[PDB]
Symmetry: C5
Subunit: 250 residues, 5 copies
């Protein structure tokens, strides 16, 4: 049971905080100027370790060049840029077998349900899922409906659809966007069933309290925890705030 | 003979009711708000068991996390969302071999004849059919003309075309839409030849009586039975109505 | 020499009549209302037998469920619908290896030269041709230019192009449309060289005599014979007319 | 060294004349009405032998049904039609291994630099080139820029680009179009470097003298020779003119 | 550690100059008319040797026909032409295995982040990266965002995105365009982290001083050095200028 394995590795305390760091490809390094140390993957690993978080999410190149075994790794297999204007699509740049060799304890794969290319990602996820089972690495589906009929990605029905799709396609754990309130988020959590839900952190909030309040809602909705990037490492007090997040979640 | 095997497993009483539950990907969880228990796959299994139905249709994720061997399983191999706006296409997210490992007694695969991508589904079905024969699992082709010249999915000529294509491509059983009357539906059944036809249930009807009359017409037309989802589990009296369906069909 | 194998199996009397029955996918069952028995593949087999024809053309599903070994089988490997609106394309739904298992004595594959997807069918045909040689099953290329610049599928130069393409791509036999006259059709036959030509029957003609006159033209032009569906099984007098075609084609 | 091999087989006299006969797919048989015997590949092989040319170029179907070993064969692996209206593309209908079995001493492959599908042919050529090396068959790249920014195919800078691309991608010999004069064409020859150049003959010229003057210019520019089709076999005095072309070139 | 291998071979003096010569396919031989000896790959090798540069970059055809082992080789695996009008895409015409057989010490692969075909290149690069690791050949990613939302290829934020993408995808070294000043260029170098950065030389500059100026800034920003083509071999004083560069960089 790969969900059970995911939880042993990434949620030993019963809840999970994963420090997300695939932004260098997904958004580019403009994200890193607020807190320039955030451009340095070594700083990110130290941060996750020092705050006592459960894991980090890296693309293959960051993992190859920097990963040192100090915190469990989720290897994000696919990746696209914001320079791309087409129907949303993100193809694997790394295989599950290579992820195993790079030290990963789980793999991550983004899908964009609704995209004109939704079929391309579903076709590839089939192969990645089969390999995840073969290599006994839990599969985290990052389910982000985008393109087609999707307008507001945080709409209650879109986030619930994202969660269900991830369960239906074989996710062992999933990452989805927060709806902005625990009632509607709890329905997303419900339709995910036996598969645990991590809230994607989102753009840096106006205040630290605003983010803390979102996290409180995520936990009240019954989610497993958070996959947070910017709301930690875009801050000059990243470690201080990370430790506050740890106190709340754990 | 995989048709004979399908009938032995799914039509032991001479007619068949399959409880369809791929809706979580195809339509999303808005289908589940009417009767919220329907979001829970365990409730669906209990429903199929308690109503005395012949099988359930699950996507791979639901099968992996929830399937318990209590009712024969049809593993629906492909899937798409309603968020998608292009020419209709649904690609496999699971292989026949993996379906066997998940406890399937048959596999399902949706095609959209007429679609600008009709070719992509015919190419893949070729590989699925070959694997179905190799693994001795019946193939249920869900034949739903859509896109292209199709403007009325329940027109007599369209449903008969759906049926015949399914036969031509190697289906061992098939699921098609009802034309709304037994005379025109009997022609679709005729052109399907030796391959048994299941009626797709469709949106929830205004009355239970309306659905029962459709089912009566399907049976008068010589179909094997129904693959029904919403018209059972979207009702708050799901089990009561399921038993009335069992009474009529068997 | 797979052309020689094709002729031995499908043209023992020196000319060939093949009963075509892929219509259930290509056109759908509206083709079958005129003579409802035509929807029953068992009727189609009895008809080919009783009329003394050389073969039948089936898609894989009809071959699997109905083929009984009684008349040689050409397994039509690809197939598309008329519901489709794109640039014409027909992809394989069956392999040559599976065709062998289904009792096929040859395989058929449609190409649409000129189509925006011309390349997709030529690419697949390459694999099917290699497999035909490996399994020693003759390949019948059904060459029907359509899409692109094609405005008249029975124009003399379009049919001759169709024929030449089939030869060039490795057909062991071919099926092409009739031009409507023996002089222009004999040029198509000529450019096909050593590869035998079968005339595709086409829509049911207004009279039986119109069809027999086309077939007469086809034979004068030096074609091997005909691959006919609707002009036989859309007729309520299917067997009577089929036997008339047998005497014209085999009798000379 | 497959260039040396090519030259040993197809240029033993130091110069080459190859009789091209892929026209039946590329242009269709309207090419053959001027001299109807030209539709008969047996006639074409006799012509090449009787004129003492170095080779013939056939598609797989003509090679299989007609090739008799009497003149060295270049198996043209791809082919498209003039009925086609899209971005120029020509895919392989034959493998290198099959070419060997059909008795080829070299393989030919057409590319259309600039085409919207340029990538499809480069992708394929990569595989063909690799196989050519494995089977020790020289690769003749037929380089014809078309589509994209290409307006005039016989412009000096386009013919030179054609020649250079062939060298860069691994051609052991190449075929390109004539620019119409020896000075500009000699620059194409130069940029081709160690890879010999064959002039593609083109449409039947108005007079036999016109073509002879072209071939002279070709030889003046330092090309290896010609790959000619129409300007020989579209002429009712094919053999007599072919012998004049042999006297000139050799 | 293939970065270290790259540096040992191509940066033994601590900085690097690579002579780039993939122009024959990328731009065509119009690039060669200024200095017609530049069309001769033997000349290019001589230049690299006599100026004491660290490598050359060749396409497979040039490597096969001309590479003599005299200067370390980067085998540029993909290639496109300027005749092409679609969304930018460059597919491999050579495998890593073949590059090893051709005598390569590293391989190069161009990506165009932002292109409608971004996914196609990312998919292919994944295979190339896996092979590079397998054959122990450093992978140089040439990261040139183009198409999509890219308006200005030398914009500070674009070049830095280019650098980060290369790191994330698994480059052992990278080649990017210069921003035109050292301050913004040092941000690109920083976000590249442990992966060394080579500046692409660009169009032949108006004066020799202008190019040196660019190079002075590139080194100031902390780049490893330059991959220069035109600004050396397009000059009629090529060898001299090349030796003035060698003086500056080393
Ligand atoms: O739609 P977005 O904002 O790009 O979200 C996707 C990004 O958010 C994450 O899931 C979590 O990071 P953040 O907390 O910074 O949002 C990243 O892994 C991913 O790249
Ligand atoms: O694509 P549509 O038209 O929504 O219908 C397809 C759906 O119908 C079914 O065949 C049967 O379910 P329903 O009885 O609820 O219609 C499902 O398996 C499938 O998802
Ligand atoms: O262009 P059309 O009319 O679809 O013709 C194609 C059909 O004709 C045939 O070649 C022969 O059948 P018909 O004699 O009915 O025309 C079939 O095998 C094929 O499906
Ligand atoms: O651009 P075109 O006219 O189609 O030229 C391509 C044709 O020319 C050739 O290279 C040589 O034949 P020709 O001498 O008749 O031009 C053929 O092999 C090829 O099919
Ligand atoms: O795609 P562009 O902008 O034409 O430039 C890329 C070219 O520049 C290089 O990276 C370096 O060569 P140059 O110094 O002449 O620019 C070449 O390898 C590459 O072909």
């Amino acid at each position: 049971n790969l969900t059970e394995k995911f939880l042993r590795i990434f949620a030993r305390r019963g809840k999970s905080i994963i420090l997300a760091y695939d932004h260098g490809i997904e958004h580019g390094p403009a994200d890193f100027m607020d807190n320039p140390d955030s451009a340095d993957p070594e700083y990110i690993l130290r941060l996750a370790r020092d705050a006592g978080f459960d894991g980090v999410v890296f693309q293959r190149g960051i993992a190859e060049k920097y990963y040192d075994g100090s915190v469990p790794l989720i290897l994000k297999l696919n990746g696209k840029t914001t320079l791309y204007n087409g129907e949303p699509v993100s193809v694997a740049n790394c295989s599950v077998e290579e992820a195993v060799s790079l030290g990963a304890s789980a793999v991550g794969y983004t899908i964009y349900p609704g995209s004109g290319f939704e079929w391309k990602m579903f076709e590839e996820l089939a192969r990645i899922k089969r390999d995840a089972v073969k290599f006994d690495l839990p599969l985290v589906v990052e389910s982000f409906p985008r393109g087609g009929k999707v307008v507001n990605e945080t709409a209650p029905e879109i986030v619930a659809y994202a969660a269900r799709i991830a369960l239906e396609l074989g996710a062992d754990a999933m990452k989805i966007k927060y709806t902005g309130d625990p009632k509607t988020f709890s329905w997303a959590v419900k339709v995910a069933g036996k598969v645990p839900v991590l809230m994607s952190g989102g753009p840096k909030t106006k205040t630290e309290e605003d983010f803390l309040k979102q996290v409180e809602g995520v936990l009240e909705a019954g989610a497993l925890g958070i996959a947070v990037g910017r709301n930690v490492w875009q801050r000059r007090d990243a470690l201080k705030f990370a430790r506050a997040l740890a106190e709340l979640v754990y």
